[PDB]
Design a protein around this motif. Structure first.
Motif: not given
Ligand SMILES: C/C(=N\O)c1ccc(O)cc1O
Length: 283
Positions: A159-164
């Motif tokens: 999830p390095t680039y995954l939105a909260p």
């Protein structure tokens, strides 16, 4: 006016209304119901219907893709459940139980098969006969959804680039079926009391606010005639948190549905319906 497609006319003799019309299958001389949808999402509804095989779910007999869509269905001589509850009319508790039990079996079958109806209402519940003790069938699969999701594939990576908001949604994902259990709760409330739990009639609170808070209109005089077990089931389906809300299995295990007499009456109606179709079997 206009005309019916030649392909339909070839197989059916069309008649009176209840868009649904009465028709006669030419081959059998048997009564059928023909649903006329004004003119693609209907094809998915057809696909869902063709796959489902439950006695409390409507069956598709034929389909015609012409100037409009024509859906040939089994005729329900009892009409809509709506007609039995409209204008403060109420069903006797025993009748609510028999109908509700069947709605629960139908919705449990749907959920087991990865289908959410999304439009459960008295209008979409059909009665097999003009008799009080009859078989019911769920109809109108137009708003229905099929339960791997995009979320499962997304969670498979880092999830390095995954939105909260995506990570936050993991808490509630897979609870979409709970909307059908809420609808059943409202249908059950209406059947028992002859009045809706949430309405704009004689109130200051907005319809939206009544639902999100889950503060249904309780009229003691109306409900005193109804058992505490039936009301307890309503309360468990009318739970705001979808994760806490009763499932069809929890509703089917509820004390109110542990009625051997109601269950026997349902198995009886089933046997009577199947009597005309029963092939001799291996002893
Ligand atoms: C098949 C159907 N709906 O899907 C239908 C509609 C109205 C009615 O009174 C009877 C029916 O069988």
């Amino acid at each position: 006016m206009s005309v019916y497609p030649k392909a339909l006319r070839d197989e059916y003799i069309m008649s009176k209304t209840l868009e649904v019309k009465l028709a006669f299958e030419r081959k059998t001389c048997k009564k059928v119901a023909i649903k006329i949808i004004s003119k693609l999402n209907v094809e998915t509804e057809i696909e869902i219907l063709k796959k489902l095989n439950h006695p409390c779910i409507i069956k598709i007999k034929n389909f015609f893709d012409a100037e409009d869509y024509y859906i040939v269905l089994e005729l329900m001589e009892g009409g809509e459940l709506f007609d039995k509850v409209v204008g403060n009319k109420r069903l006797k508790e025993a009748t609510c139980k028999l109908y509700f039990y069947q709605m629960l079996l139908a919705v449990q079958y749907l959920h087991e098969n990865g289908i959410i109806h999304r439009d459960l209402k008295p209008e979409n519940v059909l009665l097999s006969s003009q008799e009080e003790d009859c078989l019911i069938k769920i109809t109108d699969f137009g708003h229905s959804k099929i339960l791997e999701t995009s979320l499962m594939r997304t969670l498979c990576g880092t999830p390095t680039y995954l939105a909260p908001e995506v990570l936050v949604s993991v808490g509630t994902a897979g609870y979409n079926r709970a909307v059908d259990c809420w609808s059943l709760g409202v249908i059950l409330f209406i059947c028992l009391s002859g009045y809706p739990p949430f309405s704009e009639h004689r109130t200051q609170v907005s319809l939206k606010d009544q639902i999100t808070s889950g503060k249904y209109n309780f009229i003691p005089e109306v409900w005193a005639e109804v058992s505490e077990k039936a009301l307890d089931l309503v309360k468990k389906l009318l739970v705001v948190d979808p994760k806490a809300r009763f499932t069809t299995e929890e509703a089917l295990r509820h004390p109110w549905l542990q009625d051997e007499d109601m269950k026997r009456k349902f198995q009886d109606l089933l046997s009577e319906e199947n009597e005309s179709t029963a092939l001799p079997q291996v002893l």
